[PDB]
Write a protein that holds these residues in place. Structure first.
Motif, PDB file in Angstrom:
ATOM      1  N   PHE A   2     -67.180 -20.786  41.929  1.00  0.00           N
ATOM      2  CA  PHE A   2     -68.340 -19.882  42.498  1.00  0.00           C
ATOM      3  C   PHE A   2     -67.685 -18.731  42.872  1.00  0.00           C
ATOM      4  N   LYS A   3     -68.418 -17.551  42.967  1.00  0.00           N
ATOM      5  CA  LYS A   3     -67.857 -16.160  43.018  1.00  0.00           C
ATOM      6  C   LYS A   3     -68.948 -15.501  44.017  1.00  0.00           C
ATOM      7  N   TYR A   4     -68.598 -14.308  44.354  1.00  0.00           N
ATOM      8  CA  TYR A   4     -69.446 -13.502  45.387  1.00  0.00           C
ATOM      9  C   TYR A   4     -70.532 -12.698  44.298  1.00  0.00           C
ATOM     10  N   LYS A   5     -70.190 -12.731  43.125  1.00  0.00           N
ATOM     11  CA  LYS A   5     -71.223 -11.889  42.182  1.00  0.00           C
ATOM     12  C   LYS A   5     -72.350 -12.821  41.957  1.00  0.00           C
ATOM     13  N   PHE A   6     -72.437 -14.029  42.245  1.00  0.00           N
ATOM     14  CA  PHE A   6     -73.638 -14.825  41.922  1.00  0.00           C
ATOM     15  C   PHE A   6     -74.688 -14.513  42.999  1.00  0.00           C
ATOM     16  N   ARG A   7     -74.067 -14.384  44.487  1.00  0.00           N
ATOM     17  CA  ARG A   7     -74.872 -14.106  45.537  1.00  0.00           C
ATOM     18  C   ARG A   7     -75.651 -12.639  45.563  1.00  0.00           C
ATOM     19  N   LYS A   8     -74.999 -11.827  44.667  1.00  0.00           N
ATOM     20  CA  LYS A   8     -75.544 -10.562  44.469  1.00  0.00           C
ATOM     21  C   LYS A   8     -76.744 -10.440  43.400  1.00  0.00           C
ATOM     22  N   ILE A   9     -76.566 -11.372  42.737  1.00  0.00           N
ATOM     23  CA  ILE A   9     -77.766 -11.398  41.687  1.00  0.00           C
ATOM     24  C   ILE A   9     -79.028 -11.793  42.140  1.00  0.00           C
ATOM     25  N   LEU A  10     -79.366 -12.754  42.953  1.00  0.00           N
ATOM     26  CA  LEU A  10     -80.581 -13.027  43.368  1.00  0.00           C
ATOM     27  C   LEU A  10     -81.061 -12.033  44.589  1.00  0.00           C
ATOM     28  N   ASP A  11     -79.918 -11.396  45.048  1.00  0.00           N
ATOM     29  CA  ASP A  11     -80.202 -10.408  46.118  1.00  0.00           C
ATOM     30  C   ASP A  11     -80.393  -9.068  45.441  1.00  0.00           C
ATOM     31  N   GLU A  12     -80.603  -8.979  44.323  1.00  0.00           N
ATOM     32  CA  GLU A  12     -80.874  -7.542  43.820  1.00  0.00           C
ATOM     33  C   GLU A  12     -79.676  -6.671  44.052  1.00  0.00           C
ATOM     34  N   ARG A  13     -78.465  -6.940  43.883  1.00  0.00           N
ATOM     35  CA  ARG A  13     -77.352  -6.162  44.235  1.00  0.00           C
ATOM     36  C   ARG A  13     -76.353  -5.914  43.112  1.00  0.00           C
ATOM     37  N   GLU A  14     -76.725  -5.011  42.263  1.00  0.00           N
ATOM     38  CA  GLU A  14     -75.991  -4.606  40.896  1.00  0.00           C
ATOM     39  C   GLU A  14     -75.296  -3.421  40.891  1.00  0.00           C
ATOM     40  N   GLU A  15     -75.233  -2.471  41.951  1.00  0.00           N
ATOM     41  CA  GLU A  15     -74.796  -1.152  42.290  1.00  0.00           C
ATOM     42  C   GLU A  15     -73.647  -1.268  43.336  1.00  0.00           C
ATOM     43  N   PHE A  16     -73.184  -2.253  43.773  1.00  0.00           N
ATOM     44  CA  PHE A  16     -72.173  -2.180  44.789  1.00  0.00           C
ATOM     45  C   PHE A  16     -71.567  -3.881  44.457  1.00  0.00           C
ATOM     46  N   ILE A  17     -70.799  -3.641  43.510  1.00  0.00           N
ATOM     47  CA  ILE A  17     -70.142  -5.019  42.845  1.00  0.00           C
ATOM     48  C   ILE A  17     -68.533  -4.589  42.718  1.00  0.00           C
ATOM     49  N   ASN A  18     -67.630  -5.162  43.668  1.00  0.00           N
ATOM     50  CA  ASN A  18     -66.406  -4.737  43.310  1.00  0.00           C
ATOM     51  C   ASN A  18     -65.579  -5.922  42.486  1.00  0.00           C
ATOM     52  N   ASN A  19     -64.668  -5.362  41.816  1.00  0.00           N
ATOM     53  CA  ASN A  19     -63.791  -6.397  40.808  1.00  0.00           C
ATOM     54  C   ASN A  19     -62.634  -6.616  41.394  1.00  0.00           C
ATOM     55  N   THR A  20     -62.667  -6.675  42.810  1.00  0.00           N
ATOM     56  CA  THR A  20     -61.129  -7.272  43.399  1.00  0.00           C
ATOM     57  C   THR A  20     -61.713  -8.573  44.480  1.00  0.00           C
ATOM     58  N   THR A  21     -62.593  -8.095  45.158  1.00  0.00           N
ATOM     59  CA  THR A  21     -63.242  -9.089  46.294  1.00  0.00           C
ATOM     60  C   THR A  21     -64.248  -9.867  45.880  1.00  0.00           C
ATOM     61  N   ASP A  22     -65.174  -9.649  44.807  1.00  0.00           N
ATOM     62  CA  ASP A  22     -66.330 -10.552  44.617  1.00  0.00           C
ATOM     63  C   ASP A  22     -65.918 -11.405  43.560  1.00  0.00           C
ATOM     64  N   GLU A  23     -64.720 -11.088  42.711  1.00  0.00           N
ATOM     65  CA  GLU A  23     -64.381 -11.853  41.604  1.00  0.00           C
ATOM     66  C   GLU A  23     -63.585 -13.310  42.094  1.00  0.00           C
ATOM     67  N   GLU A  24     -63.042 -13.108  43.514  1.00  0.00           N
ATOM     68  CA  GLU A  24     -62.132 -14.289  43.853  1.00  0.00           C
ATOM     69  C   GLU A  24     -63.385 -15.192  44.596  1.00  0.00           C
ATOM     70  N   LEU A  25     -63.096 -16.450  44.495  1.00  0.00           N
ATOM     71  CA  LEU A  25     -63.568 -17.730  45.170  1.00  0.00           C
ATOM     72  C   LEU A  25     -63.767 -17.550  46.321  1.00  0.00           C
ATOM     73  N   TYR A  26     -65.072 -17.741  47.135  1.00  0.00           N
ATOM     74  CA  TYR A  26     -65.391 -17.787  48.359  1.00  0.00           C
ATOM     75  C   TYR A  26     -65.072 -18.983  49.023  1.00  0.00           C
TER      76      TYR A  26
END
Lengths: 124, 82
Positions: B16-40
């Motif tokens: 599980f990554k933080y990018k999955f939570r940003k998909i359902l929340d319509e967050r595609e313009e503020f996605i980091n490649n250093t903090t969202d790729e790590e497992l929460y």
């Protein structure tokens, strides 16, 4: 228990009155099995119009209007029994996600049927 | 099922990554490649052993983000006793 037990021969025969309820019910019944309407409002105006069609044909039918007006508490168990005995099959496909209460009842019915089938084969 | 919900929740906490939570929340313009790729959930499980707690604050919104946990989230709201 043999001093004041009379047998009042009431003219309201419940054995013959149950057959008239099944003939009157045979659109609203299909919406109940499809999980779309949980309120079967039986209007008394439809029963009055149904008695006028049977009176002109020559069939001696009981007074359904005066029977409900005198004791409507017993009609709730007689009308619901004819609906369950003549309930049609649901047209819409039943899924395993809508209404979780019916999923438990469907699983308990299949589990109870398998226990009764295994118990009969063990004795036979 | 017991075996079905076990493998579904085990792979959810290990993939599980933080990018999955940003998909359902319509967050595609503020996605980091250093903090969202790590497992929460991995960092939360590692902190429980160091601190010594025994309660996990599981977020129900994370189960809806994963496509493999769609049937698991619906079963939790039905009868969470089991």
């Amino acid at each position: 228990m043999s001093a004041a037990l009379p047998s009042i021969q009431l003219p309201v025969d419940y054995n013959n009155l149950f057959n008239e309820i099944t003939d009157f019910l045979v659109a609203m019944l299909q919406k109940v099995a499809n999980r779309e309407l949980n309120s079967v409002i039986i209007d008394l105006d439809d029963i009055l119009q149904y008695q006028n069609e049977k009176f002109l044909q020559g069939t001696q039918a009981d007074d359904l209007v005066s029977a409900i007006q005198q004791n409507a508490n017993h009609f709730t168990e007689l009308f619901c029994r004819a609906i369950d005995n003549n309930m049609p099959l649901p047209t819409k496909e039943i899924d395993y996600k809508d209404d979780v209460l019916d999923v438990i009842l469907n699983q308990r019915r299949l589990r109870n049927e398998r226990m009764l089938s295994d118990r009969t084969n063990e004795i036979r | 099922s017991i075996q079905e919900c076990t493998t579904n929740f085990r792979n959810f906490l290990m993939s599980f990554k933080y990018k999955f939570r940003k998909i359902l929340d319509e967050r595609e313009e503020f996605i980091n490649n250093t903090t969202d790729e790590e497992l929460y959930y991995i960092k939360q499980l590692n902190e429980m052993r160091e601190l010594g707690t025994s309660n996990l604050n599981l977020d129900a919104r994370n189960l809806l983000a994963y496509k493999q946990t769609e049937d698991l989230y619906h079963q939790l709201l039905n009868y969470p006793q089991e």
